[PDB]
Amino acid sequence: TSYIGGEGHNLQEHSVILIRGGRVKDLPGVRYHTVRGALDCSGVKDRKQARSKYGVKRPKA
Amino acid sequence: MKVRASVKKLCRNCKIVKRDGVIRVICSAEPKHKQRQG
Amino acid sequence: MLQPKRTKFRKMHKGRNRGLAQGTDVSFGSFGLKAVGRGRLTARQIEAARRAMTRAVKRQGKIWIRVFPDKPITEKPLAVRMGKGKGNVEYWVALIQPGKVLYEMDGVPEELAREAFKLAAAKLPIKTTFVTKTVM
Amino acid sequence: PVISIAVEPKTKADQEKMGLALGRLAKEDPSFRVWTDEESNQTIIAGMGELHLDIIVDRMKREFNVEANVGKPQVAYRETIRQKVTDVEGKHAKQSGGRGQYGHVVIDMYPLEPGSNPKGYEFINDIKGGVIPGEYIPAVDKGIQEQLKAGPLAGYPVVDMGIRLHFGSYHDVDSSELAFKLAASIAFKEGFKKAKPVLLEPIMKVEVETPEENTGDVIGDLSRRRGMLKGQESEVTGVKIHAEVPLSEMFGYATQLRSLTKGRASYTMEFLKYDEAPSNVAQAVI
Amino acid sequence: AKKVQAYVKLQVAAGMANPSPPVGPALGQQGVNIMEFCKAFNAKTDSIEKGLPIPVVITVYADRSFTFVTKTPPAAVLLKKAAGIKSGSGKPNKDKVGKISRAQLQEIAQTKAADMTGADIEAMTRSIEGTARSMGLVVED
RNA sequence: CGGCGAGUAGCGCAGCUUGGUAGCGCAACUGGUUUGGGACCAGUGGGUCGGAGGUUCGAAUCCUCUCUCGCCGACCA
RNA sequence: AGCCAGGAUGUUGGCUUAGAAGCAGCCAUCAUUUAAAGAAAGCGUAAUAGCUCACUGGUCGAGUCGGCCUGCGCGGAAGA
DSSP, X not given: OOBOOSSOOOOOSSOOOOEEEOOOSSSTTXXXXXXXXXXXXXXXXXXXXXXXXXXXXXXXX | OEEOSSOOOOSXXXXXXXXXXXXXXXXXXXXXXXXXXX | OOOOXXXXXXXXXXXXXXXXXXXXXXXXXXXXXXXXXXXXXXXXXXXXXXXXXXXXXXXXXXXXXXXXXXXXXXXXOSSOOSOSSSOEEEEEEEEOOXXXXXXXXXSSOHHHHHHHSTTTGGXXXXXXXXXXXXXX | OOOEEOOOSTTTTGGGTHHHHHHHTTSSOTTOOEEEETTTTEXXXXXXXXTHHHHHHHHHHHSSOOOOOOOOOOOOOOEEOOXXXXXXXXXBOOOTTSSOOOBOBOOOBOOOOSSOOGXXXXXXXXXXXXXXXXXXXXXXXXXXXXXXXXXXXXXXXXXXXXXXXXXXXOXXXXXXXXXXXXXXXXXXXXXXXXXXXXXXEEEEEEEEEESSOOHHHHTTTTTTTTOOOOOEEOOSSOEEEEEEXXXXXOSSOTTTSTTTTTTOOOOOEEEEEEEEXXXXXXXXXX | OOOSSSOEEEOSOSSSSSOTTTTTHHHHTTTOXXXXXXXXXXXXXXXXXXXXXXXXXXXXXXXXXXXXXXXXXXXXXXXXXXXXXXXXXXXXXXXXXOEEEHHHHTXXXXXXXXXXXXXXXXXXXXXHHHHHTTTTOEEEO
């Protein structure tokens, strides 16, 4: 198991993700993070700060 | 062709004949009225 | 099925069926179904004759019923040695002398009336006929 | 993009791999669309015509080893209510866990019209006299809303409602953050059966096309499947059949329509509203 | 009019063009164009009334030229217009809808008696009087 | 299909020998005591005896056949 | 009983405004042109139509039709 943060995802029951570690500790043993930005995980909606986290690319305009 | 024990004149082009002791009913208008017994 | 309220005896002797008619007319109306053969009518047949007499005439008009049971034939169940008493009450039957009218029909022309009774006669085990009205 | 197949490949197992390859088949063309259902937990796959739809899965037969079977939508259809009852009671008096747990609520859920706006479901608070204080106004609504999910008419959610409660009693420390919340549910579960409420169906409208005169060919196959034939749109040659047929009698629709019209049709359909279902066809639901 | 091959009795809606639900393919069973029959008949609604259920008698030759014979309203819907009560029977001998005299009904029976097929003018009015007692209505006398 | 055993309120039972008044213990509900549920200390509402009968001074009671639930045997070859 | 013919004009018969227009459902089943032809008889059109009949011409040209009460029979009636 693994936690997803932000707001807004695209998972339906069988999608490819890549899980990284680092627990969240509000659940006793849900022990990872899904690296949002891994092979189907769409870019999270409208992060204008900390775009390294969550993989959102350069507000060009 | 239906067997019965009661033929009944169903169509109006139903005819009654008695070919060889047996009462046949032949509707030339309709195969679904064709019957014999009686 | 039509069956008596508050009889005197539950169980009745066997009896035979000899003789001729009592009610030999059309009396209440004009069109009737008269018994020519002699046989026994059970009550469900009397229900099923009428129940398949309404939709012949599509519930309209009036139909008069002259007859009724109160010959309770009893019948033993399956697997009995003969006699521990009489059988159990199973089903009402109504004896017929030859010549009694059974159903009387009114409010309809004779034209549908001679056509509505042919569906009735095969709901009775006896033979019947159709009698129209007689004066005096 | 109007013909469709589906998947139920042993009902959970093969679906954990195969749908990603549809997206790997979706870069091939932007016409490779799928319809995701979570009413039925299925993905209904489209195609183009006679040539594409069988080699859609036949490429997945040799290169992916899938076990897909063409399926049908089996849905929840809707539910609605019929009449009202203004005497139920939220009578619980549980004791353990702490100080006390008493509740009491009189639950009156009211029938609104089937043709309504999104104000067709509401929590109309009509409390009086301080029999229930105003620090209960979300949780009495929270106890009410929880029974919408597993409403025991074979388990379907239900709409076109409105609740107008009247009467209750509450103690000092007995009535809690939970006491009305269960009282506004299990008692509201008993306000549910006594209306003889109605099962529904997701009404769609028919737009099957016709060359010039083909009404003498379709007059069976849609009239078995609930057709309310409201006419045509008439042109010089192309005229179109227009009726009203809900979703869940498209069981074998797309693969049997060309069996009828000498092999010449292309249907389209669109979903509008909620109408009711009698118990003869509601018998085939449980 | 030629012999009866694609001869129908039609046009449930005169004032509304393309009667698509009831009629629909009733001209379309031959496949005959409705796009020119409307513009021919929009040119012939200039002198007669509109928005009334007026039928048509349409016959085509073997070379796509078609011919209409339009007429007055029929007698069983004349009660809806000459009396002003857009109603029907339900059960006609046991119904009341309205009452109109024959002296009030005859004002259209000047305009239609040239158009119908009869030999006595007061007897083609009797195609409305006996109609009226058969369609739920009574007539004043 | 057939003995013994009964049906008295939501629940379970004396009233039945030898016909005469429908009570009783614990629930729903409310109050006293306490700061409050529970307990104790006391009450209120709850049936006209599954049902149809006849009988009769009046029927749960007296008898008969049915609805239903128990229970007893349903055996030799 | 046939042999060749009309075998309808009016008008979708207001319904049911279902697709119902001789002819899905309730009922009402007027009459005119008339020598005569049910605002419908069997089908049959998705509904028109198509095809036929009643009711009615010319011809052939002598008996012909449906029930009733009855005689003796046919069907119903398959077993090792």
